[PDB]
């Protein structure tokens, strides 16, 4: 019974060392300090014609812009929210009646 | 082929030198022949066949 | 005998292990040329390692220099185009040879007892090959490389709670950038050596019981030494493979590829057509067949679950398709279905390819669900077919 | 020294060309499907759009371009160049010559590659005949053997 | 008295091989 | 009856016929093709 | 575990046999065998590939003609 | 019964196809059962008389020689073949019945497969 | 016994080779703690591989980025300083345990028959360790990286006919530049996996006869199993090495190196004190003592010829220095000479260090000259010292 | 000094903690080795030989 | 002995997951 106690004491350290060396390896692959440094900024924009889009730039991500026409908004405002897999109205997504700004990366992959 | 066997195949050391010589000379013979077919199939299309070669102002 | 003196050097302890596993190992005398693809895959692995080591002496794993270092290999170093084309088309030859190898074991039921562990080690090797070839294809840093690396790291996001933290840990940042490229280069150097160890264990499992044969029967009554009989038979295949490889290398070094990877990677614009290398297309087709993120990733894992569970189905006692007419017919339908899946993955996602992709994916999984039924039903064949 | 750049960076190129980037032509015949034929057909393929198709000002119609609207203007007008040897520099002649130049630029190793391929495929074919004979010579003692056994059925 | 002949015949094989792998005709 | 293998061991046969589906022999007593 | 076999095997030296002429011996019967045994297997491999490919071209052609004004 | 050829014509063609394939190599259907596939098989094979196993081992050597040579049994030998004449199934059923009896009574197995 | 049933899982084919070679292998019961540095060397090799793989995920092998990428590991990579220090100092730890491993073998005549192949495989391993360590030291591209590489890649010029040709082919040009650094990185990734394979051959060759013991006698009558007796004996050494390693990592991470490698490489200026790592100093002092370039390279080779030729000298039949008092003192003089050569190596070339290095190199080689004659004299000891 | 070695403080805190823990592991390891070897080290061996 | 051991190892695995991954803050 005594020897189990003494052995368990050093097993605490052995598991602790194993944890540290594995977690150091794993975390060294996490985002570096300079990578995390470039993670916030904002830019300004101009304008475009009715019915076309111009991709713009950010961290590594493009942002879409699409000023919509009148029949365009009629089309975008006749969709059943229930039938959508992600129920959301167009007015919620837009801060302007026609100017549609959105992050242009597919939510799949 | 037995007369050939008596000079070259009797000792492996000679037969090895025979394979090295044939690798050398066989490779050179194919090199020349493939190049001759390429020259004959591409008449006039070479860099030495540029008419105004050397005359750029 | 008492070994007082020294006989053949092959039986000395300096060479006894090499002699008994490569020179004198008993082999079934009726092996056909379909048994020569294991050595062909071993040669392809060596060709990949040797050329890649020498290519790594000229490649720079940096997003600002990676594309140009590959162009500098093709333009400046002597014989650099050959090292590059032997490595880029060698990965294709590695996958053609291994695919023929896999379907040989499927046709003759080489996965059945006692060789279950041999198949299981092979499935692991296939996984190691896929990862190794994928991360290597990212290294040139072209349009296909960038957008290919983007989606496959994004595959981890299918897990709900910790999916996003795995994707970002894989990238080393919030996007595919130099951190992704530099770590992909390091893993691409290490993984082929793990492939070498895995194939050695794969071979050792095979030598526990010996190779299967086209008749699928017990073969101990007719066995011959591997050398010279199957060495010279493999040597026929090695030269045939060299002619096949050389045609691709010298006369069509770019047909098994997409021109989009000759455009430097542009993170702002996706190409209109984005596809993996051809050896990944059947997996691609099964992935897109599911209109769900988690469903698609789960189907990809279930592909390797079904391969791993195949040797453990309770089956009939007959191995070879040459005596299994129903299983023989299903094998050729699976082969056609696998060719169809690869072609579907090469197509844009629209009608009618979605319906065809979904049916092709279903039929592929039907092969593994029906096979245990076949052996279970065919267990009663001897009691029903009487003399 | 490398061939000189027309612009200072990609943004300067886009500013000079209506926001479109003239791509680098070192690998363009390898960077497009059917690339040599594509480049020739595109350069010589400027014509009027089909009925009912209008093209935004600053763009030109070219059916070979995906979408049909290219920011490149027609650049291969007749006699746009004067040759040193005395070849009539028509649109089709310059289109042929510039693709020969671009194809060589994408693959400058092609001639050495093709001379190597013919040489070795011929040699490896010879080794395959010897490989077959060698295999058949070794196996002949097994393939022609006469085996006698007691069993009948 | 053959070991000297096998040595001489394997030296010729070694010399032919060396002239074959490295082909120093421009240096001779 | 006597098993076929026993008959062969008991009766040496100078008129041996070989399997000729894959290889045809040279006439007996021909010089070796080495 | 070794097997216990009883058999008589006669073998002829490799240097007493023709090595290559057996490749083109009874060639027509070889082709006959290959097509006879394997025509069902070749149909189960070729029909789905060609059939599915032909339908896809048939689908794309009609769909391309419906969208044409 | 669907698997019985006397009733199902598809089972008739299945038997005919398998019988023709076995006949070409001189093999019986029981010869396709390998001792390495299952320990119940190699226990059954050891229980069979020496003459049964010798004939099976000889039929296997004959077939492997044919398979190596890319040739079939001569037609005058194929006519005397008995592809479905059984020698193994009855013993194999008995061996499996005795294994189930040991399991039902909590006894240890008489033989075990090695872990590979 | 008849193995009808399954006994202990360790004896099953899945783990019989590990059981026989690692767990149950008979070991002399009187092995001292000097017999635990073989496993330490294997652990040092594993640490170098593991830390090197994760360091290569952040390092750039370009002359314009190499120095700054190592600085980016030390600063930006989370945990980067520890990976770099465990690797930079792990290389020093590798050579310490291997040097003690080598000197253990010299003291107990472990190279003697029947283990000559073991010693010869070790010498080859030592050569691979030197090459791996040297080309790794060039990767940071500091001042000593650049000037250390310029010398060693010039060792080929001592060859008269093709010496200049080998140097420029080694360099990839006409000077040490990016082509040299890029090729050193690729070889630095590949050599440790060859080093693993050679150590596996080394361990296999030793197990053909078993280890020698401190008494140098036949030990079959008192052998015990490696597990768990020499597992817990080795574990004590592993924990002590971890303490020793930690003191270097956490408190003296830069005292084993030179500050000059923290200056980016300058091909123009030259450091007034150009030295290798401390574990190459004894070889470097032997090279410096000969006042001839060709003679110096010959002497370096002669070091490895002398080491390889040690096991094959006709010798006396007694192994251990515990019963060879003259060879014992002869050994303690070599160790003092080897320590002297390392110290002399760090000293610059001037009096009196030039003469001391010449005598010390003489004393080193005298060991391998006087060792064979001592065996020829010592074979007559049993006749002379009678009862 | 800080600019050259910004990780000094984190590195030093790790050294003190882990050398203290590793020293404790050395004590357990010493006890484990000696406990396992005690059956061997204390054994009494009786043979017939004398000289 | 079969369910008790299964729950015991399931507890050991869960404690180990909490020990390696330490999400003290994910208890929300
Ligand atoms: C002041 O000045 C000095 C220093 O500066 C500070 C030093 O630091 C040192 C110490 C240095 C050493 C002890 C190391 C020197 C020893 C060796 C062996 C060098 C290590 C070796 C090399 C650097 C050479 C590297 C080798 C190659 C590039 C070989 C390349 C070939 C390869 C990879 C394969 C060859 C290819 C084929 C055969 C073709 C087919 C191949 C296939 C795989 C199929 C000294 C003495 C010194 O005075
Ligand atoms: C780098 C990849 C591989 C290598 C180098 C390799 C090597 C080999 C070799 C040398 C053999 C024995 C000779 C032969 O049958 O050709 C063999 C047999 C086998 N392999 Fe692999 N193999 C690889 C991949 C695979 C894969 C991916 C699988 C299955 C998913 C697999 C399954 C098998 C099986 C079942 C056998 C036994 C075949 C029989 O006895 O009929 N192998 N392999
Ligand atoms: C340790 C051995 C290997 C090394 C050092 C290595 C190294 C490299 C390097 C440096 C590149 C980039 C140069 C280039 O694009 O051609 C590359 C590309 C590549 N490697 Fe490897 N490689 C190795 C083994 C393999 C293996 C085993 C495979 C196959 C499974 C493989 C598949 C690829 C592929 C597909 C590419 C991209 C080819 C292209 O599109 O250009 N490599 N490898
Ligand atoms: C004979 C002379 C030229 C040749 C052979 C040539 C070649 C090419 C090629 C191969 C492309 C690629 C089209 C694609 O991506 O499919 C392209 C695009 C382009 N070129 Fe040029 N080019 C020439 C002259 C010019 C000139 C003189 C200009 C400007 C004045 C120009 C501006 C552009 C632009 C803006 C594009 C991109 C258009 C778009 O993507 O919408 N090119 N050219
Ligand atoms: C990475 C380098 C090395 C590794 C991993 C290694 C590993 C080992 C191991 C595990 C043992 C058995 C256990 C032991 O006695 O410690 C051993 C024994 C031995 N090693 Fe090494 N070793 C290395 C380098 C060397 C070198 C450089 C030499 C000689 C130049 C050498 C010579 C020997 C000898 C002679 C033995 C047998 C010792 C005896 O039986 O008393 N080893 N080695
Ligand atoms: C495959 C395994 C290995 C890889 C991938 C590898 C990779 C690297 C990398 C990337 C560096 C540069 C980062 C740095 O400056 O610390 C480096 C440096 C170094 N490596 Fe390795 N290495 C490996 C194994 C080894 C081994 C086995 C040794 C010992 C013989 C070694 C000795 C060194 C040394 C001495 C340095 C220089 C340390 C410095 O001054 O910073 N490496 N290695
Ligand atoms: C358009 O879309 C698509 C692509 O694009 C063109 C593709 O190419 C592919 C091709 C990819 C396939 C078939 C699957 C690849 C499979 C795997 C498992 C790769 C994932 C592994 C990666 C990224 C590296 C592994 C990293 C590790 C282990 C981290 C290392 C950490 C430690 C050692 C601690 C598919 C499916 C695709 O749909
Ligand atoms: C009685 O004899 C024995 C000794 O002598 C007295 C020993 O000292 C040891 C202990 C020391 C060993 C095993 C040294 C380590 C082995 C080698 C060959 C040295 C270098 C090894 C490396 C780098 C291992 C890398 C290989 C891998 C990872 C292979 C892949 C396997 C897995 C991932 C599980 C053992 C087990 C032994 O029995
Ligand atoms: C009856 O037996 C045999 C077979 O039937 C099962 C065979 O199929 C083959 C042919 C095929 C083989 C050996 C495939 C093995 C290939 C592997 C493991 C991958 C590539 C091989 C490498 C990298 C060599 C690894 C081995 C060693 C010792 C490392 C050192 C080697 C080098 C550095 C070149 C052989 C020779 C054989 O005998
Ligand atoms: S990423 Fe756009 S759908 Fe898969």
CSV table of C-alpha atoms and ligand atoms in Angstrom, one decimal, chain C residues 21-22 25 27 38-39 42 45-46 196 199-200 203 206-207 226 234, ligand 9:
chain,number,residue,atom,x,y,z
C,21,UNK,CA,11.8,-12.5,-47.1
C,22,UNK,CA,12.8,-11.5,-50.6
C,25,UNK,CA,9.9,-16.6,-49.8
C,27,UNK,CA,4.9,-17.8,-53.7
C,38,UNK,CA,2.3,-4.2,-55.2
C,39,UNK,CA,5.9,-3.9,-56.4
C,42,UNK,CA,6.6,0.3,-54.1
C,45,UNK,CA,6.8,5.4,-53.8
C,46,UNK,CA,10.6,5.3,-54.3
C,196,UNK,CA,7.3,3.7,-46.1
C,199,UNK,CA,4.0,-0.3,-46.5
C,200,UNK,CA,6.7,-2.4,-44.7
C,203,UNK,CA,4.2,-6.4,-46.4
C,206,UNK,CA,1.1,-10.4,-46.0
C,207,UNK,CA,4.0,-12.7,-45.3
C,226,UNK,CA,10.0,-15.4,-55.4
C,234,UNK,CA,7.7,-8.2,-62.0
L,9,LIG,C1,7.9,-12.7,-51.8
L,9,LIG,O1,8.5,-11.5,-51.4
L,9,LIG,C2,8.3,-10.4,-52.2
L,9,LIG,C3,7.1,-9.9,-52.6
L,9,LIG,O2,6.0,-10.5,-52.4
L,9,LIG,C4,5.1,-10.1,-51.3
L,9,LIG,C5,7.1,-8.7,-53.4
L,9,LIG,O3,6.0,-8.2,-53.7
L,9,LIG,C6,8.4,-7.9,-53.7
L,9,LIG,C7,8.3,-6.7,-54.5
L,9,LIG,C8,7.7,-5.6,-53.7
L,9,LIG,C9,8.1,-5.0,-52.6
L,9,LIG,C10,9.3,-5.3,-51.7
L,9,LIG,C11,7.2,-3.9,-52.0
L,9,LIG,C12,7.8,-3.2,-50.7
L,9,LIG,C13,7.8,-1.8,-50.9
L,9,LIG,C14,7.7,-0.8,-49.9
L,9,LIG,C15,7.7,-1.2,-48.5
L,9,LIG,C16,7.7,0.6,-50.3
L,9,LIG,C17,9.0,1.1,-51.1
L,9,LIG,C18,10.2,0.4,-50.5
L,9,LIG,C19,11.2,1.0,-49.8
L,9,LIG,C20,11.3,2.5,-49.5
L,9,LIG,C21,12.3,0.1,-49.3
L,9,LIG,C22,12.2,-0.1,-47.8
L,9,LIG,C23,13.1,-1.1,-47.3
L,9,LIG,C24,14.3,-0.9,-46.7
L,9,LIG,C25,15.2,-2.0,-46.2
L,9,LIG,C26,14.8,0.5,-46.5
L,9,LIG,C27,16.1,0.8,-47.2
L,9,LIG,C28,16.0,0.8,-48.7
L,9,LIG,C29,16.4,1.8,-49.5
L,9,LIG,C30,17.0,3.1,-49.0
L,9,LIG,C31,16.3,1.7,-51.0
L,9,LIG,C32,9.5,-8.4,-53.2
L,9,LIG,C33,10.9,-7.8,-53.5
L,9,LIG,C34,9.6,-9.7,-52.5
L,9,LIG,O4,10.6,-10.1,-52.1
